[PDB]
Amino acid sequence: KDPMVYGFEVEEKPEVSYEDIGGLDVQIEEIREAVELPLLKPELFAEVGIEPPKGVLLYGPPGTGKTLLAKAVANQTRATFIRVVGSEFVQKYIGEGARLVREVFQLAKEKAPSIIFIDELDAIAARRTNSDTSGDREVQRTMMQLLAELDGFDPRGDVKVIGATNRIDILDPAILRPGRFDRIIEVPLPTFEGRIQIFKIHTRKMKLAEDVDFKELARITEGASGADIKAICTEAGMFAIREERAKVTMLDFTKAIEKVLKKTTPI
Amino acid sequence: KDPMVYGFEVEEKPEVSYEDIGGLDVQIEEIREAVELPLLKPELFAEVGIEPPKGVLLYGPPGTGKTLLAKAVANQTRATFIRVVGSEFVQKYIGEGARLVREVFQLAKEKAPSIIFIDELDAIAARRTNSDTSGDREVQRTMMQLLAELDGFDPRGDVKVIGATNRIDILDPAILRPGRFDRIIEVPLPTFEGRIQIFKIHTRKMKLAEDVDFKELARITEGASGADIKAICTEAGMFAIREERAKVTMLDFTKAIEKVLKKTTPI
Amino acid sequence: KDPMVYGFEVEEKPEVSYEDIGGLDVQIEEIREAVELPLLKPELFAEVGIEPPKGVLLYGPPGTGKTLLAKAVANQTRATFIRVVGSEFVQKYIGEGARLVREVFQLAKEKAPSIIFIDELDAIAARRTNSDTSGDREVQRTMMQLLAELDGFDPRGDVKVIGATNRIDILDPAILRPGRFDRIIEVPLPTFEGRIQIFKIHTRKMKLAEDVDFKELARITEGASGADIKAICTEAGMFAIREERAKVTMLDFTKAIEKVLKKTTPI
Amino acid sequence: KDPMVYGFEVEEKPEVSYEDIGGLDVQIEEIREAVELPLLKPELFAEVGIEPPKGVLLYGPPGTGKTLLAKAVANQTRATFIRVVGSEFVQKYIGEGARLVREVFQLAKEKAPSIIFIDELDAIAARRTNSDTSGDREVQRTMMQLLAELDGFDPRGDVKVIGATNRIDILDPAILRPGRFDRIIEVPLPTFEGRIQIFKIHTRKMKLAEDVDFKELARITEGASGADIKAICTEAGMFAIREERAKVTMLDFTKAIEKVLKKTTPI
Amino acid sequence: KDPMVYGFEVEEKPEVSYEDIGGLDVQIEEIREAVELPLLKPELFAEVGIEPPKGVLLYGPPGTGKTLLAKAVANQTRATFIRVVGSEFVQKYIGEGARLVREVFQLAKEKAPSIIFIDELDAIAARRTNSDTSGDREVQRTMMQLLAELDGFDPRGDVKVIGATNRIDILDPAILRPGRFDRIIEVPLPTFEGRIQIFKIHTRKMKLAEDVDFKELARITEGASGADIKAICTEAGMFAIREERAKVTMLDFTKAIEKVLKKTTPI
Amino acid sequence: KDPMVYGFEVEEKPEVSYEDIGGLDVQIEEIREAVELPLLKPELFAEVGIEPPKGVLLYGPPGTGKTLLAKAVANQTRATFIRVVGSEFVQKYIGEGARLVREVFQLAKEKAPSIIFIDELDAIAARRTNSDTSGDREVQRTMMQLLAELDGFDPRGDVKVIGATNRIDILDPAILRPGRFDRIIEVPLPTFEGRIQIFKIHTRKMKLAEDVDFKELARITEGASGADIKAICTEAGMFAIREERAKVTMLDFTKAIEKVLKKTTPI
Ligand SMILES: Nc1ncnc2c1ncn2[C@@H]1O[C@H](COP(=O)(O)OP(=O)(O)OP(=O)(O)O)[C@@H](O)[C@H]1O
Ligand SMILES: Nc1ncnc2c1ncn2[C@@H]1O[C@H](COP(=O)(O)OP(=O)(O)OP(=O)(O)O)[C@@H](O)[C@H]1O
Ligand SMILES: Nc1ncnc2c1ncn2[C@@H]1O[C@H](COP(=O)(O)OP(=O)(O)OP(=O)(O)O)[C@@H](O)[C@H]1O
Ligand SMILES: Nc1ncnc2c1ncn2[C@@H]1O[C@H](COP(=O)(O)OP(=O)(O)OP(=O)(O)O)[C@@H](O)[C@H]1O
Ligand SMILES: Nc1ncnc2c1ncn2[C@@H]1O[C@H](COP(=O)(O)OP(=O)(O)O)[C@@H](O)[C@H]1O
Ligand SMILES: [Mg+2]
Ligand SMILES: [Mg+2]
Ligand SMILES: [Mg+2]
Ligand SMILES: [Mg+2]
Ligand SMILES: [Mg+2]
């Protein structure tokens, strides 16, 4: 009953895999497993006795590759990858958003095995409630619907809903609890070695000089996220273009670390 | 009229069943008194001469369990278990919800004995504040139909409205009270012994455990919810296969209780 | 007659009479003089030269048996009790609501005297703020229709639109102001004499009780509502059932009183 | 002879004349000069040089008696009085419907001089969203149809348009522009002298024995409305029955106002 | 083929070049490298093996000419230009604001290459911590929807935002980080030199000074925005009409510097 | 197809001109400099090289017929007159407030020349909050879209607008900034000589007047507006028809002044 199945991009697998992400290695493995083993290895569960987890919640500072973690799971279990955005519920008609939730779930059930990937939970959950609010009351009646098709009366299924958000601090605690969203995976800012892998992903695409030491660059870029690193390389390339080289030398990388980081914040 | 799955649906199939009556065990006895005792033995109500309780309002924090409770009971009764959901009301068009509330209830009378488990509908029922906005007032109307049909003017038959709500800090005084339920149930976080009963079921499913001490798990899991415990159990399974074991060990619980509460309990 | 208003009428032998309500007590007598006194005797209002009430408004604290009292008066008027519900009005087009208010008043003019009981005046006539727009506008659309008929321009005969509301102020000032609903009878919470009498209605239908002291019973249940007295009674009776006796005694009440009291106090 | 526009007239002179409406007293004269005088002789209005009202809107808080004043107009124009409800202008489907709006105005042109009263413009000149489809289009359409039609037959008296509205703040400017209505008569809540007069007329029909001072009661009932006074009277006679006196006296009104006033804006 | 979002596409083909605006000459070079240049020659990005910039985020005062930098670019690239005022989004009809950014984005992919200018990120950015319980959540739904399309899942599509803001400290963390706006550009009030350039352009549109010297004027105009340097020129022309010369010269220009500053700084 | 106006009311070629205006004689000439004469003479925009005026704001004491001047400028330039009322702006949300600003801008480009009358400036012209508050915020997101759009315009399609306000001293200096509103015109409360000339306009209409001395009338109406002078003349015709004479003289004028205008004195 969905022409919104085009807005769920059921076909077109992404290009981002586990090898297009990295330096968040501990995180890849739990989330990977939380839907990968249930689907390809369900006999392993039988034998030990294991309950299938019914979702994974992801949170973390912005730009750490949450989006990328989701894409990688979607790509590499190739089974029904339902991408929705929580901001996509709630319309001008009086409880259309909640109707709309019921549609995703009945659709996922039919098309099961299925993984639902929700981007942004901050536009569809609130940890407060309030009564007689214009912008914060129907969004609580499409949340309340949600709680409630994911697990509730309606089984299980084979979802496995991957939630993603930029802050869990303004999210309703019903989402926040396990039993559905059973592995609560924090994704932190990357570490010393971590910033080094992220560098090499973009650099793998690029040409470089052979006096390029990642270890030195990663020292400078301490307290920055994966998104700051992508932009550093990009911007470093722009310096390569102006000066007409088909490679990025070490000195551009240091210019870029100074440029990008400086124009974000003065720590 | 024209009923789709709406309430009409009746199902009571597993996982939640009459042998996964995890609790919170005094609380289950209270549901059995309210619903199942006049259903199975009506003559006892003729001797006292009371009106049999008309509904069980279960409330609590999330995941503590009330979906639980209500389905486990429902399989026992073998009654017409009416499943409606918490904002399937007013789909896009208006007063739609008021016609659903009536429909559900009228069919229920015909199919009485019948039980109406409505997920979160008590929480949608909220107060109005003057002047203030015209709201969001229109959904609150759909609540008023529920009061009228339950025993407001039109007899119940043998309904048995099971309420569900994540807050008692969101309700109008006119749903809260014992008058549309009567049997108002606090479902708190599971008792010391209560908590051991939840682990028992899960461990049963998870074969061999021979060094695990469930009581000790209980001291560590002080003031965790019922859905929390089930994820603890799930992650203990997971660490079991990460150590490549056919059974779940005592370390495996220690790690999962540590992981599960950390991400979800504030400092 | 279209199905609509066919089916609004007529409730044959209502449960509830004045020996199935009692305990308040003065405002009971006031309503009964207000509707039953000119219906059974038009002469007394005629001799002074006054107009009987155009309607009677019931408001205030939930649980005081407002709709219950309506079901009492219906049994002794036998003047045609039109049961419409404030939420029953309004559907998926506008003016289809209007149609229904126009139909009930035309129908009533013929049955005159007759009782139009509108469950919630506030559904179809709520305190506006502005258009937010789907059904909110329809509400003040419908309010226009109800006025209009009442004795706005069109002969009322001897109706007698009797209302009730869940909240103090949630209604347009027009309806609030008397001269349309002309007696504003606050049904308040029962008196010291009134709470004893309420327990008595229950005692009538719940067999045996003499170790109970009605006065002291009432004294404890201060600040409760008629629905709460009923709820205690149903709880008490379950208490007795647990100790297996068909007599209700005081100890059964004390346990039952506590259940309700836990909710509402500590202050 | 379409049943809908034929059914909106006539009563062959309603109940109420200017005699039976108590004092305002001076704003009665404004209405008499605004409506009645230009109807009988627009030829005299032209000869003077002035332009008669496009329409006259009655504005004031509820209960001042606005539609009460319209019944008075009705008896004394002698020109066929249209009682229509603006709630019936918007309808369930279309050009019944929209056409009904042009039909009423056509009826006026052949019945002329006449004298069309529409009655509340609450929810037929409010704001639309452009649009919410089923609600809005009806209201937006009917808004335009009203304004064009009254404009195009009044440069000068032909068909006089009268109306009234509950408030002029609950609807957006549309009918407030002096291209449309330019003469809006404040129908206040009544002067000190006005109350005394209303009290007088109501006791005029009433059988009493003289010791009443209508003036003392007026000081008391300052800050009410004419409909409350009517109520005070009906309750003052009802009191008379309860003492079993077939006469009303001062003691009874003083008491009667105390009851009514109390359920109302306060002592 | 809906005029509702198709109207936002091309602005009749701009007339504004990057030599019709200046004074922000450093900033102009930056914008061209990031946005224009990919479109100009793809192979440079291939050569260095980089992912091309997302685009530019401009911040700064008001009047600076953020619009004019998008207008310039659009003329020069020979590609789709979609100009949207970003504060126009956000409706009091809940989730219509989010719908509108969703469609503009999807349409941008249909007509790729495309540039969108989302002006003012102030009124489409909220504060997570409470300040307006209904205003923050609403704004947030619009914000996280446009972000969703921006790189939540759905590709760039060779879009190319390009988007301005008065205040950058009011933005949520989500949009603030790069990778949804790759190159954050400071665009400050005109420098010393910046005055002289802006002036010169605008006086080439007039009759031009006869007694040229923009350095004197510049000293005085320091501490104003770019619109304000223009503004003086326009004030100068009209002053010319009042004098009865209608030719602009240094005397009109200096008298204008004074006349606009009279308002501005208040000695 | 028939056209149906939006941004109501619209008068394409309004028939009120400056012949209908008297005693505001130099205020006509200033505003002819502001909009009229620029617009019909495109030579000025080449002979000076000036970039057109974008608005002129009318100020000084209210009630003077600021709407009427606006119509007279629209008449002269043969444009589409468009009315924006400020009461249809700002609620306590936003967005349809915003929408309607957009609407009249769209209509105005489409049908240039076009005169957007913008009363009233005090509900979208107000001060800034940078210490924050919530109520002020509604106004600020509305206000920026007026400010922007007017500057956004292309010189292909000239949408000149004429503002009007009661108090300029409560508004932001930002809308008193040249290149938005270039000049302001004190339309003052009428002088002695002004009042005599405004009575004469109305007298054209009125019959046999040869006893009326206009001077004694102006004296009495010290501190009277133009809307009040016009209203006095309608009322004069009412008084004349009360004394049963179609001849309007001076006695009628004197009673009309007392009745309408004289209320204000004493202080
Ligand atoms: N884990 C990482 N590995 C490699 N690249 C990364 C990593 N994190 C971020 N990036 C780069 O930064 C870009 C932009 O960040 P992205 O859009 O992926 O973030 P997100 O964490 O979902 O953000 P938000 O909190 O704003 O929703 C990526 O497309 C990638 O090029
Ligand atoms: N007491 C229990 N024993 C065993 N497992 C439980 C228990 N309570 C909850 N769970 C498990 O937790 C999961 C989700 O919780 P459930 O649906 O029962 O929550 P609820 O308290 O009704 O919440 P919400 O406020 O989100 O509607 C199910 O998998 C259920 O079996
Ligand atoms: N005076 C009374 N004596 C006995 N029982 C009473 C009395 N008044 C109320 N009750 C009981 O209280 C309950 C509520 O009655 P009712 O169904 O009339 O709702 P209400 O007070 O109109 O409610 P709402 O605010 O939910 O519309 C019933 O169970 C009724 O039997
Ligand atoms: N001046 C008056 N003289 C006599 N009776 C009055 C007076 N004013 C009001 N009433 C009484 O009030 C009623 C008529 O006015 P009513 O209260 O219906 O309101 P309205 O001002 O037309 O309201 P709305 O805006 O709700 O349509 C009658 O019952 C009448 O007896
Ligand atoms: N730097 C500048 N060079 C030339 N014109 C300018 C410059 N800055 C602003 N303007 C002009 O001033 C007017 C309004 O400024 P605009 O660019 O719309 O403002 P904002 O930065 O607030 O978006 C326009 O007519 C615009 O051309
Ligand atoms: Mg993200
Ligand atoms: Mg639940
Ligand atoms: Mg009730
Ligand atoms: Mg009325
Ligand atoms: Mg701009």
Swiss-Prot record, chains A, B, C, D, E, F:
One GO BP: protein unfolding
Gene Ontology molecular function, alphabetical: ATP binding; ATP hydrolysis activity
SS bonds (residue pairs): none
Positions that bind ATP: 63-68, 202
Keyword Protein biosynthesis in record: no
Localization per record: Cytoplasm
Keywords, ordered alphabetically: ATP-binding, Chaperone, Coiled coil, Cytoplasm, Nucleotide-binding, Proteasome
Keyword Coiled coil: yes
Any GO CC annotation of this UniProt entry: proteasome-activating nucleotidase complex
Sequence similarity: Belongs to the AAA ATPase family.
Domain notes per entry: Consists of three main regions, an N-terminal coiled-coil domain that may assist in substrate recognition, an interdomain involved in PAN hexamerization, and a C-terminal ATPase domain of the AAA type.
Subunit and partners: Homohexamer. The hexameric complex has a two-ring architecture resembling a top hat that caps the 20S proteasome core at one or both ends. Upon ATP-binding, the C-terminus of PAN interacts with the alpha-rings of the proteasome core by binding to the intersubunit pockets.
Role noted for this protein: ATPase which is responsible for recognizing, binding, unfolding and translocation of substrate proteins into the archaeal 20S proteasome core particle. Is essential for opening the gate of the 20S proteasome via an interaction with its C-terminus, thereby allowing substrate entry and access to the site of proteolysis. Thus, the C-termini of the proteasomal ATPase function like a 'key in a lock' to induce gate opening and therefore regulate proteolysis.
Protein name: Proteasome-activating nucleotidase
Organism: Archaeoglobus fulgidus (strain ATCC 49558 / DSM 4304 / JCM 9628 / NBRC 100126 / VC-16)
Lineage: Archaea, Methanobacteriati, Methanobacteriota, Archaeoglobi, Archaeoglobales
